[PDB]
């Protein structure tokens, strides 16, 4: 080496090293040790370059232009020895990164000035072979570029974009050379439309080849399988690195196929880590993306639509940033409420559904940027939001709180006797309307909320449940994964100025051109409070708990139990009566002629958060306890429900006793 | 825990008096239960040595079972209960392997009396399992050299003159040992050997009868077994018999024969481990049927049983085995049948639709048929190697992992790409660094095998270090980056902590929200056996050669020992020069200028 060294220095013989390494001369040898008695053939070039790389890798990089050229004016005949100087010069250029700096991006744009020389390589009719090695080449240069000299024009895009758009369409090549493009598409995302909607148009045909429309249709432990959700996963991570509004759009038509995903968690984290992350630009064109999905009149069916909202748009908005839902919600103030003031049809099965789902995602929209937003903007002095159509500035107050809560209002106080088209729908319209009117009740005003039913055959506790659904309560709560992420990078792909040999590691898989993954201590890795919680309900199996309208209004009673109403320190709080909302609750439940359903209701809110039903007491303590004991309930034998029921109000015991009243003791002997 | 001797040897006292006074002695009361407890406390028993007092006190004195199982002599339908004696002797014996000789001599006796005068059944099966366990308990004929083999064999010779009305589950289990009455010492068994042959194969094809009479199936299963275990040890190579061993193979050849009625197996399981265990036996047998057999065996290794499927995985690999080293030996006129062959494994290896177990055997052929390609040839083996290297970097070089086992697979097919390697005039250029990754990962996933398995996965890697190093000087410089890589990922993995690790196996860890896997995390330690094994050599040098049909026969070759230790020291001394170890102090600070005093600087050390 220190003789080649020397060699090198005396002159700037760069020419007669890239000739010796580029040329066909076999040194035939012996079977190396014993291997089968007759000769080895290998090259001199290759021999060569393999012993004293890094003096040949320097010197090449010393004279680059020079160097660069010859190599590729070279690569017609000798595709073996040019992809090998190549690889080995951006290997030395990727080592040394901190402090070699722009050699490498040097070298990149000097590779890619000469992409028509290489326009041989990766043609039709081509080896396979070789299609691989011009990809490999392509995605060591993406890298070593960092995306800084590399871009939509002035960077001779052109032949590169077709380099890259060709490998995609091409149908010999096998899934994980197209998972390395997938990998590669984020150096393509700064499109500008036209021309380059062909990405799209390949993205979508690739799509549709290679993916079931049932995400069941391969079992566990097939090789179709482990594929499939391979090419998800790098979908996934190249939208995560990439922020395309595109690869959100076609991720989420994947998604919302089918109710159930079999990889439905990927799905979500990456929506959540995309959230979280980015600037505001990105996000509200992100939003405006999937909001512009939802609010388009296709042939698309209901519960498609449904989802757009449910699964992918939620989870971006409650991981938004402030000022982007704002904006968003000015954006999108004017249409929502005059289609949630909009009549109905009712003529067509067709045009009912979508009417009904469009609604129900408006309000659940309205719910979360009022959930999440403080009240300096949805009503205030100085709000942005511009509700009304004159605007200018004009007057003051809430023009926009009140006509949504009336419209709320107006959605729970339906009567549906002699109505029968589509029922749960509108149960969910309803319970809809009503956790969109608590977000929006639970930070404008204070003290004592709406009035409550009111009669007048428009009560909402008949609209919001089902009536018929027998819940199947069992005996306890019992008896109501997948492919997980896998293996991890750990101590790899960065060198993260933490460790050496992480940073090796690093650029083992550079070389190679593979990821490597170790083995994990857990298979689940949390990595924060991710999905965990939302900015005590360990129970999700009951069909009462997991029921639309449970967690909201059990939020709410919590909300009324803290800062409102009397001041605390209150000695025997009037124990003659209740406050409006609770001798509303208390007259619901109390009654035995309310439907069954209603009645489990309200007395599971009572058992949920117990703190608030406790004030108020030898009130509540008749009302379960008729329901736990009558013949009709949530069925036979000491079901949990019962055990809670019981446990609850024995523990309430010496604050009050269910003694004295001679109607309450019968029952309790009853219940004995 | 503690006081288990003292109650075992009260209920031995127990019952060593419970025969007295009255000779009903609680008819089949008073004794089953106490034999029941005691077999429960001795099954429920704990891991120390504590358990060798009990193991004494049990073969002992008077107030021991076997003395109580001698006075049992004259039981005439008295005391049904020496048939659970016999079980819970058994389950203790494959409970506890006998520490001393001199209690199987009496195990032994006590278990030939007790076959003398025993009336009807519900014990013979018991006494001939116990029989069958206890001759396994050696396997090294140190011990039990007495040789009373002589009147064993006289006395089953002496049963098999009635032949009337022995009952199924007795003839069945009479026949295994009869059969496991081979393979216990030389010089024994070889002037009767010809007359009970004779015998036993007269009596099996009585069994089949081939007609439509009663086949007896529980006993052609046991006749299965024993033709089995006769054969481990005699050669009885049909090489030089060409009629008495013919009709052996046709014998198993009807017995794989599938049908509807799976008649709880046994009889389709015995003839395949036969098969698996004796293929090298049937010498072109195998080959004047390969379609069939072959057929029949896949159809085997497609069901749901365990054992059938493990009997089948077998059976399918030493045929396979089989066929490829005589087509390897004569592969010049042998040319249809690897035609066929390697058809059904291109048809299996590109069918993207197909299974684990499927996909395993197609690479196993892959590895076994590369030779014969090689010869008829040249251009085959190419497209084999870049058809299993894209499976391999499929299937493992991957971050999916649904759940399955996807590691205990991966020597199975290490050691058959090596052959493909090996067989290689030239390697693509392209596929070297999959290579790489797949030899390393191998090396990381180490310490998740048993030692069998830890064995196979050296032996792959010196295989796959052999095919490597006999290619070129270039993949020579492939090999030490592979062991680079796999010391640095070794030096990576978390540092043993100075503390005590306390009491070992204290829980089973927090247990929480569905912690399953057993991924155990390595240590420094955990891969001193690999680098040992890799380092010795020269047993998996010969063991591959005696395997394997190469031009390795050479001392050149065999030297891995001096290339692994020179990549190890070169690897060492990289790692060394590579590291970073400056050492700075971080609780102080810069830029200090009329600031508080214990900002300002520590006191001077």
């Given at each position: ?570 000695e025997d709080s009037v124990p003659r009566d209740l406050p409006?909302?609770m001798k509303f609750l208390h007259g619901k439940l109390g009654n035995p002629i309310v439907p069954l359903?209603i009645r489990l209701?309200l007395a599971?809110?009572v058992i949920?958060?117990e703190?608030?039903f406790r004030p108020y007491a030898k009130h509540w303590l008749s009302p379960l306890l008729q329901l736990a004991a009558s013949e009709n309930n949530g069925?036979?034998?000491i079901h949990?429900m019962v055990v809670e029921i019981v446990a609850t109000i024995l523990s309430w015991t010496g604050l009050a006793t269910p003694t004295g009243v001679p109607k309450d003791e019968v029952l309790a002997n009853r219940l004995l | ?605």
């Open positions: 080496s220190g003789l080649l060294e020397l060699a090198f220095a005396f002159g700037g013989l760069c020419e007669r090293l890239v000739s010796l390494l580029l040329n066909p001369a076999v040194l035939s040898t012996a079977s190396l040790g014993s291997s089968q008695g007759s000769v080895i053939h290998f090259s001199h070039g290759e021999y060569f370059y393999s012993l004293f790389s890094e003096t040949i890798n320097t010197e090449l990089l010393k004279n680059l232009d020079l160097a660069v050229l010859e190599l590729m004016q070279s690569s017609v005949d000798n595709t073996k020895m040019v992809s090998a100087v190549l690889n080995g010069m951006l290997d030395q250029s990727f080592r040394e990164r901190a402090n070699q700096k722009h050699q490498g991006l040097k070298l990149a744009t000097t590779i890619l000035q000469h992409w028509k020389k290489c326009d041989s390589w990766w043609a039709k009719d081509s080896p396979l072979e070789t299609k691989m090695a011009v990809l490999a080449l392509l995605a060591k240069i993406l890298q070593i570029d960092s995306s800084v000299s590399f871009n939509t024009s002035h960077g001779s895009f052109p032949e590169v974009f077709t380099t890259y758009i060709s490998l995609l369409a091409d149908t010999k090549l096998d899934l994980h050379l197209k998972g390395q493009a997938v990998t590669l598409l984020p150096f393509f995302t700064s499109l500008t439309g036209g021309s380059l909607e062909e990405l799209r148009r390949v993205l979508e045909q690739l799509i549709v080849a290679h993916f079931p429309m049932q995400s069941r249709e391969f079992p566990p432990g097939t090789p179709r399988f482990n594929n499939y959700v391979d090419c998800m996963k790098k979908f996934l991570d190249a939208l995560e690195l990439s922020q395309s509004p595109m690869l959100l759009e076609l991720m989420t038509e994947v998604l919302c196929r089918e109710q159930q995903h079999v990889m439905e968690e990927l799905f979500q984290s990456s929506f959540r880590r995309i959230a979280r992350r980015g600037s505001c630009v990105t996000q509200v064109g992100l939003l405006e993306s999937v909001y512009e999905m939802f609010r388009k009149d296709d042939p698309r069916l209901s519960f498609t639509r449904q989802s757009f909202v449910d699964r992918s748009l939620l989870t971006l908005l409650w991981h938004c940033s402030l000022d982007a839902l704002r904006e968003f919600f000015s954006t999108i103030v004017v249409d929502a409420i005059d289609v949630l003031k909009s009549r109905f049809t009712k003529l067509n099965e067709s045009t009912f559904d979508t009417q009904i789902t469009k609604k129900m995602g408006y309000y659940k929209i309205l719910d979360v940027m009022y959930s999440r937003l403080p009240k300096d903007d949805v009503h205030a002095k100085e709000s942005k939001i511009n509700q009304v159509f004159h605007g200018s500035c004009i007057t003051e107050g809430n023009e926009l709180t009140k006509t949504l809560i009336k419209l709320c209002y107006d959605a729970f106080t339906e009567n549906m006797a002699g109505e029968n088209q589509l029922l749960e729908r509108r149960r969910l319209y309803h319970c809809a309307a009503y956790n969109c009117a608590i977000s929006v009740i639970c930070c404008v005003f204070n003290e004592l909320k709406f009035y409550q039913g009111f009669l007048f055959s428009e009560k909402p506790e008949k609209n919001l449940l089902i009536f018929e659904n027998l819940i199947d309560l069992k005996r306890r709560y019992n008896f109501p994964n997948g492919d997980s992420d896998g293996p991890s990078y750990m101590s790899s792909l960065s060198y993260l100025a933490d460790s050496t040999l992480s940073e090796e590691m690093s650029q083992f898989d550079f070389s190679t051109g593979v990821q490597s993954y170790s083995y994990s201590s857990q298979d689940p890795r949390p990595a924060t409070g991710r999905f965990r919680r939302r900015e005590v309900l360990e129970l999700e199996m009951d069909e009462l708990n997991r029921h639309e309208c449970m967690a909201p209004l059990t939020a709410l009673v919590k909300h009324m139990h803290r800062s409102l109403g009397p001041p605390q320190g209150e409006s909302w359903n209701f599971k809110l949920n958060t703190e608030v069925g036979e034998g949990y | 825990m503690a006081g288990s001797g003292a109650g075992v040897r009260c209920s031995l006292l127990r019952l060593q008096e419970t025969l007295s006074a009255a000779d009903r002695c609680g008819a089949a009361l008073a004794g089953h239960q106490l034999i029941r407890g005691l077999g429960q406390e001795c099954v429920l028993s704990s891991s120390p040595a504590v358990l060798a007092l009990q193991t004494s006190l049990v073969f002992s004195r008077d107030f021991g079972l076997l003395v109580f199982v001698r006075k049992s002599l004259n039981s005439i339908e008295f005391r049904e209960c020496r048939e659970e004696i016999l079980k819970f002797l058994c389950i203790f014996l494959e409970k506890m392997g006998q520490k001393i000789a001199p209690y199987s001599v009496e195990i032994k006796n006590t278990c030939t009396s007790v076959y003398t005068k025993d009336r009807a059944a519900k014990c013979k099966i018991p006494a001939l399992d116990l029989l069958i366990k206890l001759l396994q308990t050696f396997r090294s004929s140190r011990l039990m050299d007495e040789f009373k083999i002589g009147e064993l064999f006289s006395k089953f010779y002496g049963e098999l003159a009635l032949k009337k009305k022995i009952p199924d589950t007795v003839l069945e289990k009479v026949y295994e040992l009869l059969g496991l009455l081979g393979e216990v010492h030389p010089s024994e068994m070889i002037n009767n050997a010809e007359n009970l042959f004779r015998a036993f194969l007269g009596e099996l094809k009585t069994q089949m009868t081939s007609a439509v009479r009663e086949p007896k199936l529980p006993v052609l299963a046991g006749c299965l077994k024993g033709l089995s275990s006769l054969l481990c040890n005699f050669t009885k190579s049909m090489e030089e018999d060409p009629q008495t061993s013919r009709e052996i193979f046709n014998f198993v050849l009807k017995a794989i024969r599938p049908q509807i009625d799976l008649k709880r197996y046994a009889v389709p399981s015995a003839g395949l481990r036969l098969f698996a265990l004796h293929a090298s036996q049937f010498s072109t047998c195998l080959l004047d049927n390969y379609v069939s057999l072959f057929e029949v065996l896949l159809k085997w290794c497609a069901h749901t049983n365990v054992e059938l499927k493990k009997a089948a995985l077998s059976a399918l690999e030493s045929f396979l085995k089989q066929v490829s080293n005589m087509v390897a030996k004569n592969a010049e006129m042998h040319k249809n049948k690897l035609q066929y062959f390697m058809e059904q494994f291109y048809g299996i290896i590109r069918n993207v639709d197909s299974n684990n177990k499927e996909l395993s055997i197609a690479i196993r052929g892959y590895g076994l048929f590369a030779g014969p390609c090689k010869v008829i040839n040249a251009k085959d083996v190419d497209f084999m190697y870049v058809e299993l290297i894209q499976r391999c970097k499929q299937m493992f070089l991957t971050q999916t992992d649904t759940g399955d086992d996807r590691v205990y697979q991966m020597p199975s097919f290490l050691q058959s790409v090596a052959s493909v390697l090996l067989y290689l005039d030239t390697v693509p250029e392209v596929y070297t660094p999959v290579l790489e990754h797949l030899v390393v990962m191998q090396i990381d996933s180490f310490p998740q095998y048993s030692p069998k398995m830890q064995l196979v996965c050296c032996r792959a890697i010196v295989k796959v270090f052999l095919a490597l190093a006999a290619k070129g000087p270039v993949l020579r410089n492939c090999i030490s980056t592979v062991v680079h890589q796999g010391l640095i990922r070794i030096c990576s993995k978390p540092v043993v902590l100075p503390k005590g690790p306390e009491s070992e196996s204290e829980d089973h860890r927090a247990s929480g929200e569905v912690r399953t896997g057993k991924w155990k995390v390595p240590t420094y330690k955990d891969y001193v056996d690999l680098f040992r094994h890799l380092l010795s050599s020269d047993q998996m040098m010969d063991s591959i050669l005696a395997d394997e049909a190469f031009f390795s026969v050479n001392s050149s070759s065999e030297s891995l020992n001096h290339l692994l230790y020179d990549e190890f020291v070169k690897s060492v001394l990289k790692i060394v020069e590579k590291l970073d170890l400056t050492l700075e102090i971080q609780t102080v600070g810069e830029q200090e200028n009329g600031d508080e005093a214990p900002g300002v600087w520590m006191i001077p050390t």
